[PDB]
Amino acid sequence: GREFGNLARIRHVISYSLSPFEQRAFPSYFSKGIPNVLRRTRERILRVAPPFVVVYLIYTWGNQEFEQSKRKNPAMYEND
Amino acid sequence: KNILRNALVSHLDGTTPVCEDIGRSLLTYGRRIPLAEWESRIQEVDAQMLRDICSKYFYDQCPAVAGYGPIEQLPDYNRIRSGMFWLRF
Numbered sequence A: 001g002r003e004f005g006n007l008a009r010i011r012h013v014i015s016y017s018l019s020p021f022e023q024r025a026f027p028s029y030f031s032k033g034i035p036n037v038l039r040r041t042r043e044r045i046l047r048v049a050p051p052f053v054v055v056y057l058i059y060t061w062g063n064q065e066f067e068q069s070k071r072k073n074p075a076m077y078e079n080d
Numbered sequence B: 001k002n003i004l005r006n007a008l009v010s011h012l013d014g015t016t017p018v019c020e021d022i023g024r025s026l027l028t029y030g031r032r033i034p035l036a037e038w039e040s041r042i043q044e045v046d047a048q049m050l051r052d053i054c055s056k057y058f059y060d061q062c063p064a065v066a067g068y069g070p071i072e073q074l075p076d077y078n079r080i081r082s083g084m085f086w087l088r089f
C-alpha cells in the first residue's frame, strides 16, 4: 500500500547523480570535515554542554561532602 | 542475424535512404561498405563472439540513466548498477 510510485506528488524537480566508481569515496575528507564538525559543534555546544558541566560540579561536591561527612569532628572530645 | 539482414536490405530501399547511406558512409568510414561485406560480417558472427562482445560492452559497466515523468519507482543508481551484473555469473 505504501511503496515507491505512490508516496508523493513532485513536479519540475531535476536530480543529478554520478556513479560511485566515477567519484572518490573521500573527496577532501579532512579539509572539509574539520570545518563542518566545528560548525556543528559550535551550533550545539551551548545547548548540550552546561547541563553536563553542572553534573560534574554536583558529582564532585557530593563526593567531597560525603568525604568530610566521614571526617571526624574536632569539636567533640574538647570539653574533657 | 536474419533480422539484421532484413533490416539492412529493407532500409536500403528507395533513392533517399541509399543517398543517405552513401553520405554517411563517405563521412564516417571514408568509403561505401557494400552489402556483400555486411553479409560476410553478419555470417561470421556466432554465439560465442556475441556473448564475448556483449560481456565486453554490457557486463559490469556503469550506465547512463535518463528518466522523465512519474519516475519515483525508477530505481536509483546502486540498484541499476547491481543489476548490471549477476552473482551467479
Ligand SMILES: CCCCCCCCCCCCCCCCCC(=O)OC[C@H](COP(=O)(O)OCCN)OC(=O)CCCCCCCCCCCCCCCCC
Binding pocket: A042, A043, A044, A046, A047, A050, A051, A054, A055, A058
Ligand atoms: C541568553 C543567551 C545568550 C547567548 C550568548 C552567546 C552568543 C550568541 C550569539 C553568537 C552565536 C554563538 C553560537 C550559537 C549557537 C546556537 C544558539 C544558542 O546557543 O542560543 C542560546 C541558547 C538558546 O537560547 P534560549 O533557549 O532562547 O534561552 C532560554 C534559556 N533557558 O541558550 C543557551 O545555550 C543557554 C543554556 C543555559 C542552560 C542553563 C542550565 C542550568 C540548569 C541545569 C540543571 C541541570 C540539572 C541539575 C541537577 C538537578 C537535580 C538536583
